[PDB]
Amino acid sequence: SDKSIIVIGMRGTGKSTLSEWLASFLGFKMLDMDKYLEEKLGTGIKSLIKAKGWEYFRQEEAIVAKECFTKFSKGYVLSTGGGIVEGEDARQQLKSYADNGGIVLHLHSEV
């Protein structure tokens, strides 16, 4: 119960609300897996994909997704991104949270 809720799903104009509205309900904190990126390098989110590509944007995402699932385990409702499940190994570390007893959760033309 006191554990996190890993919210997978898409990105909308109101899908960032239910990530923090879930944080505000349980008295739990919130850590987005998108806005965590710009303070450790100092550069923007969209400035990293247009400069190198999808590869090292994923490799930077894959390393930082490990520790916040275990040292930010008890308390932050970890709002994960939209293209996280695009790769194979990020699909598998999500499934590691399932059988241990986690509450991994999905919140349901170009779009």
Annotated binding residue 11: yes
Chain breaks in the chain (C to N over 2.5 A) after: 108
Annotated binding residue 16: yes
Which residues sit opposite 105 in a β-bridge?
7
Annotated binding residue 75: no
Annotated binding residue 12: yes
Q: What is the resolution of this structure in A?
A: 4.2
Annotated binding residue 33: no
CA separation for the pair 90, 95 (Å, rounded): 9
Annotated binding residue 91: no
Spatial neighbors of 84 by CB under 8 A, at least 6 apart, are 8, 33, 61, 65, 90, 94
Q: 14-39 burial, b if ≥16 CB within 10 A, otherwise e?
A: eeeeebeebbeeeebebbbbeebbee
CA separation for the pair 108, 101 (Å, rounded): 22
CA separation for the pair 56, 37 (Å, rounded): 13
Annotated binding residue 44: no
Residue labelled with tokens 């190994």? 89
DSSP label of 104: -
